[PDB]
Design an enzyme around this catalytic site. Sequence first.
Site, PDB file in Angstrom:
ATOM      1  CG  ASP B 290      -2.054  -1.150   0.994  1.00  0.00           C
ATOM      2  OD1 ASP B 290      -2.675  -1.540   2.010  1.00  0.00           O
ATOM      3  OD2 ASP B 290      -2.348  -1.687  -0.103  1.00  0.00           O
ATOM      4  N   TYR B 374      -9.458  -1.214   1.642  1.00  0.00           N
ATOM      5  CA  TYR B 374      -8.857  -1.191   2.941  1.00  0.00           C
ATOM      6  C   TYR B 374      -9.146   0.279   3.245  1.00  0.00           C
TER       7      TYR B 374
END
Lengths: 620, 620
Positions: B290, B374
């Site tokens: 990420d 997320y």
Amino acid sequence: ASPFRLASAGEISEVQGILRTAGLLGPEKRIAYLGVLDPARGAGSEAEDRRFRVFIHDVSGARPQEVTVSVTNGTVISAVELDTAATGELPVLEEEFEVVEQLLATDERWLKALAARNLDVSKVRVAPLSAGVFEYAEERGRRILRGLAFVQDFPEDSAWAHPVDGLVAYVDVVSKEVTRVIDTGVFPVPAEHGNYTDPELTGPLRTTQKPISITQPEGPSFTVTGGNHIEWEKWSLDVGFDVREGVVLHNIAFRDGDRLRPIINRASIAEMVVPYGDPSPIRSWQNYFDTGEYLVGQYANSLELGCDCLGDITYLSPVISDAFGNPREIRNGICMHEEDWGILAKHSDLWSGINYTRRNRRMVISFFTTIGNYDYGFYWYLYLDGTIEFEAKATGVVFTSAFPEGGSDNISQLAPGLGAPFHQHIFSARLDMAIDGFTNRVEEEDVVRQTMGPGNERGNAFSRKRTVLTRESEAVREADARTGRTWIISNPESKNRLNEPVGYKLHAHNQPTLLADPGSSIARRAAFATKDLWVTRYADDERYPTGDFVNQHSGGAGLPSYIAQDRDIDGQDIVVWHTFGLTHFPRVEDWPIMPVDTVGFKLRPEGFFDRSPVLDVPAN
Amino acid sequence: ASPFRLASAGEISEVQGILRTAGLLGPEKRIAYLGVLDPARGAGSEAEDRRFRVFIHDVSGARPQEVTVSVTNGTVISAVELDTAATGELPVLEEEFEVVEQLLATDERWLKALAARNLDVSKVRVAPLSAGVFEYAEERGRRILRGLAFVQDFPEDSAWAHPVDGLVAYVDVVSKEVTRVIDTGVFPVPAEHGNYTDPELTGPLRTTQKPISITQPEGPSFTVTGGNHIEWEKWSLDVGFDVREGVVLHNIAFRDGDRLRPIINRASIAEMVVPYGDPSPIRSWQNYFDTGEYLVGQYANSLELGCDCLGDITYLSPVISDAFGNPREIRNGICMHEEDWGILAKHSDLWSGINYTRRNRRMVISFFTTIGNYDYGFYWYLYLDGTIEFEAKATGVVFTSAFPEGGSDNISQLAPGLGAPFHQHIFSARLDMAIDGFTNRVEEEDVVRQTMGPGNERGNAFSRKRTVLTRESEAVREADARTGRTWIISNPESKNRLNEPVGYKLHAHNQPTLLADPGSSIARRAAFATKDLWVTRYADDERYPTGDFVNQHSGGAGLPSYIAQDRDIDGQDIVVWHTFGLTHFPRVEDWPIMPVDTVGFKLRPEGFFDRSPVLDVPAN
Ligand SMILES: [Cu+2]
Ligand SMILES: [Cu+2]
Ligand code: NA
Ligand code: NA
């Protein structure tokens, strides 16, 4: 109406009256322990029988008694004389805390030891310390306390700054005799004061902290009925209090739609021990069972508003017995409040355009106790999402010694000449489980790594395994942090909408367990502390991991004896006993008063619910 | 004046202008990354040189460039063409998020796959997912994204409820070609919706939550100067922000009496990876960096008051570059506030009669980001007592799949037919240490058990040992929770009043590290994730544990390459890299939107101070 209500002042007076009437509480008798018993299994159907258990000491040297009384019926149910050499001495009495110092002050051996160190006897405080069980044959069947000395320069001085090392005494507190005085040699008594309210040491107090105001303009979101029944954000429980265990939670359940679903029948800290790791003969016997020997509930602080507990606080003021059977209230001894707990759930979705944020909260039920130098906060938390957590907060003043010239492998230095022996604080949580009712089982769940090969050609797969603990002989378990080991308590007869058994997962902190050699007295007396998780079949007389009488009691009772029964725990009424502790190598920052440090555990729902239980929490 | 101030809109515009003037930012160029560089070591003495680092992509297929610009001087310092097959592809561009779906929508293979499942192409969302490095030779040197499909029944529907399993596609986002479409067979697309704002699923919203009001009537206790310099309860720091790392803390120091004592020079989350543990070929390539691939700062949420951040909040609104070099503000992207944190220290002394209670507080610096499904909160905490802590809060919607008929060892069931593959979220915290300055070392400290015998006749002693990590080859360490393993960063040339080196102790959570087979692509690309603690000698080009270019980049860079230099770290300028993560076996309670779960670490002073640093905190 609830058979789980707190004991009232009237009930305690009534126990006193029943005992008196029965010939069991004459002028030489003292109450060492008194508490209400929980209702028997299945008792909900029959009318109330409030029963109280009492340990009665005799100051004239006669044998003590264990007595059960029915306060409802005004009767003695049972009374048995105890042989303390066999089953253990009664808990230390409040009235014994002065006796060690008082007896020592006119003993020639003690006086000679103090004169060798040029210490004024009027300034020497003596801590009344539990004795344990070592090599001294004459102590068997006798109520002994050991005394360590600390100098107090003036009435408001912190004596912990001035330990008198090289000296220990043993005292029979019933016959009022000094059995031994041991002087291994003089050590310098550390000179610096440890007065944390003295401006000379604090310096000018900070003026930089602006107020934080926490208010609830419509009052709290929880209700209290029947004195101690709490209802809050789908949770339901009763808050008990026992002089030994402190705050005890009963009937923890969650209202899922229309159904009140049990989770835990009873939760408590059933023991806590503080073993010391200094091999000096002055302290090598030191292990304080704060719960079992001293009774942590008895020393619960009165908690001041905006100070010990901040926000919109609801207090309970539990009642206990004094040494004569008179009720004594602990004013504002239990704090109850709800707290904001940050973000509960959040998602900003690219495809739907929907942004969603919800806040979490927790219900807090706490008390704080003082055991000599230690002060401990015991906190239970219920969260919106179904999580249950316990946290212990350890503070107070560290137990001190001299710091040896040339250092120590077992003591840290805090100030010039001032040491702090290494020690642990180890707790046992007793969780009488009731996951969707009493038919429960425990599985140990480990992460499972997988080898690259057929079925896993990229070497990315990982899995997990669960092992059911079927009988008590298989249910003494250790931590394995590296494999992410947890334990799941499930109900094999209650399934969620996906046809999976409902459950809760216990997440431990995986801190070290008891460090002492397995052949030590403490490893036997605190056997529970050597392993992280035990599971037993429920029995009404299996209350504490150390047995009923811990003081000067060898191994023979408690968890190792319970599990020898090797009972079925696979879909039965079971109890989980979780050991968790802090290992403390004191730091200079811990002196002269220690900042809080914490330890605990939590349990999270694991397929208990059919989806998130917090979808109905409103925005903002 | 501070060379650590946040980038301003003007500085970004100026970088754009300098690049344009130099011939480096024509119409086919796009900025994939732009950030300010930290001042060089020793630079405090010379005037400011604000330098910015830029990764420039070319949409016409030309090679990208890495460029450093001096915005102070209006010059290009360096510009080098990248060979991405060797050193890695640039981070995924925001503008590429639509491209996978758009290209797939007119591809005959994709259309045939959707028609086999009776899915309307206009309703099929395609996630633009990082590709990693596997067996596909044609991808080397090409910018590839992979696409997994999710059905959206209507504009406001949560597509995550409707994964299309058995299907994956690979796309060249520069040449705008579909390289592969893989269809392993039809799976039922799960039918139940996951719309957590739909009243049909939430039911009636609770009306039981009464307000909690947190106010500061005199304002906050912290000051902000120079845009981002914080001063709070003896702490001093600068709050940076970088599009890759997010919130970065600089110059964390504590004012002890008259002296400003450094503790940490720079603290950041330098990488975070989410590896998936499902061996299905549809997802076995799935590992989302990420931070390194997507850039978590770029997707920081605008945080709404009384909602994302509660109380008296001070916001920062960091500025980043869009794809063309224009400044874009993230409004209210960083929250700063102080929070009450219960009891700090407490003792009620029997002998002195003094009762003492003080409250704790913490300073909180946070942001929240969204990466597809997320959402993560990144929280830094500074406490009154000198403790420093990081906490990550994971929420959002779980990544879904079909749930196989007959179950799975690598996927959990959430709803009928709906699965959630097992995965981890693993973070790397990069702590450029400066304990009382830059001359530091690290020791690994373990508890030491001792055998009953001579010197320890009661078998109660326990101790500890410290092992100095002298060179980088010896400084790749694993957790040992059972022995209470921690790591102490100390300054061997700075001693406290007890003649001991000052230090800070890192306390890890000891959660499992990367589970993948050591021969996997992910174990090589996320090597940092296989061990809990690394220590390197500071170098200005050693920024990330995965290197500068993570996207489609094999092993070869990052921590394993840094430590091969085997540099001296015993009393030198060092950096600690701590790996910590969550291992997630999704539960039914995680669906349809997940309650927050947490992971983190903390550092506590260890003989840093000469006594407790909070003796001057005032009562009430
Ligand atoms: Cu301690
Ligand atoms: Cu997850
Ligand atoms: Na049970
Ligand atoms: Na450093």
